[PDB]
Design a protein around this ligand. Structure first.
Ligand SMILES: *[C@@H]1O[C@H](CO[C@@H]2O[C@@H](C)[C@@H](O)[C@@H](O)[C@@H]2O)[C@@H](O[C@@H]2O[C@H](CO)[C@@H](O[C@@H]3O[C@H](CO[C@H]4O[C@H](CO)[C@@H](O)[C@H](O)[C@@H]4O[C@@H]4O[C@H](CO)[C@@H](O[C@@H]5O[C@H](CO)[C@H](O)[C@H](O)[C@H]5O)[C@H](O)[C@H]4NC(C)=O)[C@@H](O)[C@H](O[C@H]4O[C@H](CO)[C@@H](O)[C@H](O)[C@@H]4O[C@@H]4O[C@H](CO)[C@@H](O)[C@H](O)[C@H]4NC(C)=O)[C@@H]3O)[C@H](O)[C@H]2NC(C)=O)[C@H](O)[C@H]1NC(C)=O
Ligand SMILES: *[C@@H]1O[C@H](CO[C@@H]2O[C@@H](C)[C@@H](O)[C@@H](O)[C@@H]2O)[C@@H](O[C@@H]2O[C@H](CO)[C@@H](O[C@@H]3O[C@H](CO[C@H]4O[C@H](CO)[C@@H](O)[C@H](O)[C@@H]4O[C@@H]4O[C@H](CO)[C@@H](O[C@@H]5O[C@H](CO)[C@H](O)[C@H](O)[C@H]5O)[C@H](O)[C@H]4NC(C)=O)[C@@H](O)[C@H](O[C@H]4O[C@H](CO)[C@@H](O)[C@H](O)[C@@H]4O[C@@H]4O[C@H](CO)[C@@H](O)[C@H](O)[C@H]4NC(C)=O)[C@@H]3O)[C@H](O)[C@H]2NC(C)=O)[C@H](O)[C@H]1NC(C)=O
Lengths: 207, 206
């Protein structure tokens, strides 16, 4: 029969009041001969009727996939309410129910540092700027590099790693032209995390 | 019936000639009522007879698990030969065969840099050293920090990340006593990868 997966909102979406967090319930292995799936949503066991649901074909193996997106209030996530999807179908011996909520635990703001290129790289045409983000809990975080406020082109993030004390760390690596680095630059690391004031902080090499 | 999974050697083991790389074949859902499975191993379709096999109980669900560990020659893995386990038993309708080999692809040696602590930490008793390992392919790598050659305790590695040019990078973070680092400079980053000369390099602060 079908299988159901449940997915949280993106951390940036739930921490920035201007964005639209969504909880998503995905039904896979739905039969082409029985596409009708009934999906019911609950918030702390109260049924709600606001989800947007769409069906598509998975050509890889001739099955259907149903995607149900529930728009949520930021504060319902942050306050630890439980979101539940209940999936019914003729091809199921019982409804499938999946639940998700913001895990309850310690909160510690990240310490953010920007590191210059290693000295040995300074003979190269392109150099590497590193943003160290550490000591944070929970692991959910959003990190980007920006230049003059514009979300940067060539950076890449590591995933968070569990440190020896139970906090997490990650690094963000930015490649830049050495010319741009030595000349007046505004490269900045920007971090979104629930432990920060206004859920956001930036670090830069200069003002 | 049973299911068979096959696992590669650890990258450090297969790159270091002093270590012992192993290819492992795991049979799950063996019946406690019929524990006997026959496992045969082949390298480039040549049967080999050196594997060590054990059986044990999985009490979670009253099944057995059989683990067969083939000690391999490093060059067989590195040259792209296929390793095959073949699992049989009197009640299977046909044997189950699993194969594994080193993935094909390009090789790029890592560039390794050590980064000092952020200047903000330099007023603290403990500081953070960073080893930046980048531009490598394939993603299989081993990275550690050492202190006067002794493998260090308090470091943690990121996993590799796919970079914009199809190569990989990672970082390794080590916490040290500041006094000790500024005085003795005893900490170095050691990297084991296919692309390096002797499959190894070490990087120190200058
Ligand atoms: C038929 O084919 C399909 C398709 O196959 C795939 O695609 C084709 C083209 C081929 O390439 C093929 O090789 C591929 O496999 C098969 O469908 C797949 O079925 C398997 C199940 O068999 C599914 O596997 C689960 O995947 C989960 C992860 O899914 C995400 O990530 C993968 C990539 O890593 C994506 O492919 C998926 O689409 C998912 O992506 C996420 O989707 C979210 C929802 O949209 C996104 O979030 C939303 O994003 C929007 C913006 O877009 C907004 O931001 C919203 O706010 C937000 O909500 C999200 O961004 C996106 N992420 C990414 C990274 O892209 C796994 O989580 C899951 O693992 C769990 O379950 C396993 C049991 O099945 C178990 O073994 C695991 O241990 C794990 O168990 C859980 O563990 C946690 C703890 O960690 C516990 O809490 C739980 O208790 C426990 N739960 C359970 C249930 O056990 C599965 O591995 C796969 O998702 C699915 N793919 C697709 C595309 O649908 C199908 O099976 C084939 N059928 C047959 C019969 O062969
Ligand atoms: C009865 O219960 C048992 C036990 O259950 C478990 O334990 C209990 C207590 C509960 O906690 C329960 O929740 C647990 O599940 C059940 O047994 C399990 O059965 C499932 C299958 O149903 C097995 O799932 C596969 O797992 C593979 C990964 O296994 C490793 O990682 C897990 C942790 O994630 C470990 O638990 C395992 O033990 C494995 O660990 C590895 O073991 C290696 C061998 O020992 C180690 O390597 C060796 O290490 C030594 C040093 O120690 C040397 O270095 C050697 O050199 C070296 O070789 C290795 O270090 C170690 N790793 C880790 C991290 O520990 C998955 O890979 C596999 O996925 C494939 O197959 C799926 C289909 O089954 C498919 O959907 C997946 O997509 C995936 O498919 C593959 O995809 C790739 C591309 O992505 C393709 O290339 C392949 O073609 C494709 N393959 C296939 C076949 O399609 C499975 O998920 C599970 O391992 C097993 N657990 C154990 C412990 O045995 C049992 O099912 C129950 N029975 C019943 C009837 O209920």
């Amino acid at each position: 029969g079908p299988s159901v997966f449940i997915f949280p909102p993106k951390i940036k979406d739930v921490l920035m009041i201007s964005l639209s967090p969504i909880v998503t319930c995905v039904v896979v292995d739905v039969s082409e001969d029985d596409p009708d799936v009934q999906i019911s949503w609950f918030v702390n066991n109260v049924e709600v009727h606001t989800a947007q649901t769409q069906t598509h074909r998975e050509d890889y193996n001739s099955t259907l996939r149903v995607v149900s997106a529930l728009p949520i209030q930021h504060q319902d996530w942050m306050s630890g309410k439980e979101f539940k999807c209940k999936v019914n179908n003729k091809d199921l011996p019982a409804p499938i129910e999946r639940t998700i909520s913001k895990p309850k635990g310690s909160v510690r703001a990240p310490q953010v540092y920007v590191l210059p290129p290693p000295e040995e790289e300074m003979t190269k045409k392109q150099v590497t700027l590193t943003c160290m983000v550490k000591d944070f809990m929970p692991e959910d975080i959003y990190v980007e590099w920006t230049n003059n406020g514009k979300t940067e082109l060539n950076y890449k993030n590591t995933e968070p790693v569990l440190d020896s004390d139970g906090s997490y760390f990650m690094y963000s690596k930015l490649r830049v032209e050495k010319k741009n680095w030595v000349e007046r630059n505004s490269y900045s690391c920007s971090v979104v995390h629930e432990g920060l004031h206004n859920h956001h902080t930036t670090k830069s090499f200069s003002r």
